């Protein structure tokens, strides 16, 4: 079960103090690991809002989410020797 990830997420313009709703989706298992990083040298963006994942997919949230998270919300989903990763544009204004 290698993790087919097909979310195109482009950018996500998000308002600087509101709440975002990111979602996304890949067909992994028995049990792959999506990391959500924030595009910045391996950059989580745990600390800077909210975040799920499932083992076939995966989306996170910006409940807090501020100008400082303008970033690169980017993705990587794999498992076992399957792999993938959707990349995610976040701005926030």
Do not use: C, M
């Not at 195109?8 to 975002?20: E, L, V």
């Not at 989410?65 to 926030?92: P, Q, T």
Request: charged fraction near 25%.
């Amino acid at each position: 079960l290698k993790p087919k990830i097909l979310t195109a997420s482009r950018k996500i313009k998000i308002k600087a103090g509101f709440t975002h709703n990111l979602e996304v989706d890949f067909i992994g298992a028995p049990d792959p690991t999506a990391t959500w990083t924030v595009g910045d040298s391996g950059a989580a963006l745990a600390p800077e809002l909210l975040v799920d994942a499932k083992s076939s997919t995966t989306s996170i949230f910006f409940p807090s989410a501020k100008r400082a998270d303008s970033g690169n919300y980017k993705l990587k989903v794999k498992n076992e020797l399957g792999e993938d990763e959707a990349i995610f544009e976040v701005i926030v204004q």
